[PDB]
Amino acid sequence: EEKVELTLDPDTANPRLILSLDLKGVRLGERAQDLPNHPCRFDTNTRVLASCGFSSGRHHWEVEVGSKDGWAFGVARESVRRKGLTPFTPEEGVWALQLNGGQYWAVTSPERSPLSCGHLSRVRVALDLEVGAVSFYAVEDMRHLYTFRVNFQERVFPLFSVCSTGTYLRIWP
């Protein structure tokens, strides 16, 4: 329910990321940029949020994914830690799919869950704050990939992480 028009929040972006000027695309750069030290900025983890956070309702958006390893995306609670090295786990307030070692995974803790979904090109993220779910679909055939069940009780932001050079995420279109 309700396609949303998202832009990456440049006050959150870790200084090693390269954002697109239209605030849709993100990759990892070779060096930290000299960005201003905003309190909301991830100073260590390779993360950026969208500027829009959701308190209720059902929302969906699409993410164009690179073929090469080194990305994760989904949603984060607003209280996700910004300063210091924070584990990438549901307990630390991130719910995401990742591509690592040529395999797709739901980032569950304490063990990640391997998916057998085959090659991904674009992924729909559906957030339902009434039901308490974030779900991922392959856009081709809208095949269900994975749903995290969470009793979300703070604002939820779209989350992107790129931890290797040579891959990318882009909010589509």
Numbering used by the authors: 339 to 511
Publication passage describing the model:
To contribute to the understanding of the mechanism of action of TRIM7, we solved the X-ray crystal structure of its B30.2 domain (TRIM7B30.2) in two crystal forms at resolutions of 1.6 Å and 1.8 Å. Even though the packing of the molecules in the two crystal forms is different, the structure of the four independent molecules is very similar, showing backbone root mean square deviations (RMSD) smaller than 0.5 Å for all pairwise comparisons. Despite its high structural and sequence similarity, unlike BTN3A1B30.2, which would be able to form dimers, TRIM7B30.2 is monomeric both in solution on the basis of gel filtration chromatography and in the crystals, according to the quaternary assembly analysis with the PISA server. During the refinement process, electron density that fitted well to a malonate ion from the crystallization solution was observed in a positively charged cavity found on one side of the pocket, in all four TRIM7B30.2 molecules from both crystal forms. Malonate is in the same position in three of the four molecules (chain A from the 1.6 Å resolution structure and both chains in the 1.8 Å resolution structure) hydrogen-bonded to Thr384, Arg385 and Ser499. The most external carboxylate of malonate also forms a bidentate salt bridge with the guanidinium group of Arg487 from a symmetry-related protein molecule. Furthermore, despite almost certainly being a nonnatural ligand of TRIM7B30.2, malonate binding reveals the existence of a potential binding site for negatively charged regions of such partners. During the refinement process, additional electron densities connected to Cys378, Cys390, and Cys501 were observed in the Fobs-Fcalc map in both crystal forms. As the TRIM7B30.2 crystal structure showed, the β-mercaptoethanol included in the purification and crystallization to prevent precipitation at a high concentration, reacted with three of its four cysteines without significantly affecting the structure as revealed by CD analysis.
Tripartite motif (TRIM)7 is an E3 ubiquitin ligase that was first identified through its interaction with glycogenin-1 (GN1), the autoglucosyltransferase that initiates glycogen biosynthesis. Human TRIM7 is a 511-amino acid protein that displays the canonical TRIM/RBCC motif followed by a B30.2 C-terminal domain. TRIM7B30.2 structure reveals the typical B30.2 domain fold consisting of two antiparallel β-sheets of seven (β1, β2, β4, β9, β10, β11, and β13) and six (β3, β5, β6, β7, β8, and β12) strands, arranged as a distorted β-sandwich. The TRIM7/GNIP1–glycogenin interaction was shown to be mediated by the B30.2 domain, whereas the CC domain was involved in the protein self-association.
